[PDB]
Amino acid sequence: PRQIARYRTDNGEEFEVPFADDAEIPGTWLCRNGMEGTLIEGDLPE
Known part of the structure; x- marks a missing residue:
């Protein structure tokens, strides 16, 4: 999907x-x- 993805790191910093x-x-x-x-x-976990 054409969205801004936001990955939250171990520090809690969002990317x-x-x-x-x-x-x-x-x-x-x-x-x-x-x-x-x-x-x-x-994504879908197994």
């Missing part, structure tokens, strides 16, 4: 990253801090 509508949004992504932040409700 904004604009994706296109062709891209799927996961709840983990390496951020500019060097930590995989968790986007608030994203």
Whole structure:
């Protein structure tokens, strides 16, 4: 989806990253801090 994705890091810092509508949004992504932040409700867990 074409939304601004927001990954919250271990520090609680929220990270904004604009994706296109062709891209799927996961709840983990390496951020500019060097930590995989968790986007608030994203992909489907197994």
